[PDB]
Write a protein that binds this ligand. Structure first.
Ligand SMILES: Nc1ncnc2c1ncn2[C@@H]1O[C@H](CSCC[C@H](N)C(=O)O)[C@@H](O)[C@H]1O
Length: 241
């Protein structure tokens, strides 16, 4: 698993990258009230979103990640903070269902599907993980990002290259950490996402813009966020059966 070589550097990135506050705000905006809900946190990393969802009153939280090292970090954080989260090592594209939840949170899952067939498999796994009145909240790569229109290094992600891959694109990148931490991701088109969503059985969905706010703009020089707004690497997505 790629993040077996990243480990704690990902949390370092979340503490230093300018984009992180925006993605975190956007995801919790999409989630809304979690009181009493059962929650499945996919591509959970060290568990950030599932853990904070628990802190905000969810009834039961389960996290899944492909990286054994990241899950060992997640488990240690749950010990450190005395919380009841449970974790599993799985490739979400190939995993058995672990139950039907009120909410699936997938922050940076689908941009790691390494083929359009695996993108479609992941959406089907998510649908199988939801109650009929549940919802998927996802955060992924914006299909319209183009490397030539501006890199994201100033916001925490140095995108190194861009190459056709299947019906989409693949990108090598690094988180801007000390030292930088390399990873790869996949940029699937809006049409392929919407097809995967519908074919998995989600009859409702919407793309959600990143919630850049006035105070973000005020605390940087004018124009700092222009590449973020004109060539955004990220987007939210909410889907409902
Ligand atoms: N196919 C797959 N199935 C499950 N997890 C995956 C995956 N491909 C990548 N990942 C995991 O996705 C994570 C992306 S980093 C994001 C972590 C967390 N959602 C957060 O935002 O804080 C990594 O921990 C990586 O190991």
């Amino acid at each position: 698993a790629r993040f077996d070589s990243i480990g704690g550097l990902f949390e370092d990135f979340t503490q230093s990258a300018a984009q992180r506050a925006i993605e975190v705000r956007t995801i919790f905006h999409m989630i809304g009230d979690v009181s009493g809900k059962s929650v499945l946190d996919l591509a959970c990393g060290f568990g950030f979103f599932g853990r904070e969802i628990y802190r905000r009153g969810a009834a039961k939280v389960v996290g899944v990640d492909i990286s054994e090292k990241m899950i060992e970090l997640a488990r240690e954080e749950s010990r450190k903070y005395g919380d009841p989260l449970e974790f599993h090592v799985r490739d979400v594209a190939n995993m058995e269902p672990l139950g039907q939840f009120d909410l699936v949170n997938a922050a940076w899952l689908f941009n790691y599907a390494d083929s359009v067939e695996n993108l479609r498999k992941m959406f089907k796994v998510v649908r199988a993980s939801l109650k009929p009145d549940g919802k998927l909240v996802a955060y992924t790569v914006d299909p319209d990002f183009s490397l030539a229109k501006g890199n994201f290094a100033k916001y925490g992600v140095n995108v190194l290259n861009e190459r056709a891959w299947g019906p989409g694109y693949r990108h090598d990148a690094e988180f801007v950490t000390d030292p930088p931490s390399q990873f790869s991701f996949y940029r699937w088109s809006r049409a392929d996402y919407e097809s995967a969503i519908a074919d998995a059985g989600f009859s409702h969905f919407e793309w959600q813009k990143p919630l850049l706010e006035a105070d973000d703009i005020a605390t940087h020089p004018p124009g700092f966020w222009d590449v973020f707004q004109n060539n955004c690497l990220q987007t939210g997505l909410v889907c409902k059966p």
